[PDB]
Write a protein that binds this ligand. Structure first.
Ligand SMILES: O=c1ccn([C@@H]2O[C@H](COP(=O)(O)O)[C@@H](OP(=O)(O)O)[C@H]2OP(=O)(O)O)c(=O)[nH]1
Length: 179
């Protein structure tokens, strides 16, 4: 039971908080592959197996985790943006992202590409978009994102709680500048 508890706590950290310090990239719903999670756990606890994780999941008294096929997620408590139920934002016309002036040349040429995760996050609220960017640098530049542009190229936009939205990427065509 001690081994189950220390492994469980580490799964909670990986699955809710920082999958990128283990090289993992969750999908929009928060899932990573089970084999990747096992390999990640094994770097701290070499005895972990996929069968051990399945038992932790199925015996968890709180419903912390969900396995769907060969993928696994935490069901709650995330501190990075997820769309747990794949809920589409069909109504937003404009979305916003704040970029420090430093990353302006690459962002303008590339758009917003997924780096740490499988998707990028933006906001419906321009002030909240600016605040997010300030945490990443000074002299933040507002990107205005045409959501209908995004949908025309097949990028579904997902609700991720309150004003946050996620999308696989934002091509440069969908972006214009503002203060
Ligand atoms: O068997 C276990 C015991 C705890 N945990 C989670 O490890 C953190 C431990 O914090 P604690 O022990 O002070 O409560 C916390 O996760 P957090 O840092 O995301 O809040 C908790 O999650 P929970 O009990 O709230 O579900 C787990 O996964 N499995």
């Amino acid at each position: 039971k001690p081994e189950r508890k220390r492994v469980s706590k580490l799964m909670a950290y990986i699955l809710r908080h920082s999958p990128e310090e283990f090289g993992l990239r969750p999908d929009v719903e928060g899932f990573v592959s089970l084999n990747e999670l096992v390999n990640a756990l094994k770097t701290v606890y070499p005895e972990v197996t996929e069968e051990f994780v399945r038992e932790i999941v199925e015996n968890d008294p709180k419903g912390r985790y969900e396995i769907r096929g060969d993928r696994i997620r935490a069901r709650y408590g995330h501190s990075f943006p997820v769309s747990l139920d794949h809920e589409e934002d069909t109504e937003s016309r404009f979305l916003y992202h704040g970029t420090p002036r430093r990353n302006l040349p690459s962002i303008l040429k590339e758009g917003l590409k997924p780096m740490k995760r499988q998707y990028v996050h933006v906001s419906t609220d321009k002030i909240e978009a600016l605040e997010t960017g300030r945490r990443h640098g000074r002299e933040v530049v507002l990107l205005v994102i045409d959501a209908e542009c995004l949908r025309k190229r097949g990028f579904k936009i997902y609700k991720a709680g309150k004003n946050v939205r996620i999308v696989e990427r934002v091509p440069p065509d969908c972006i214009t500048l503002a203060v």
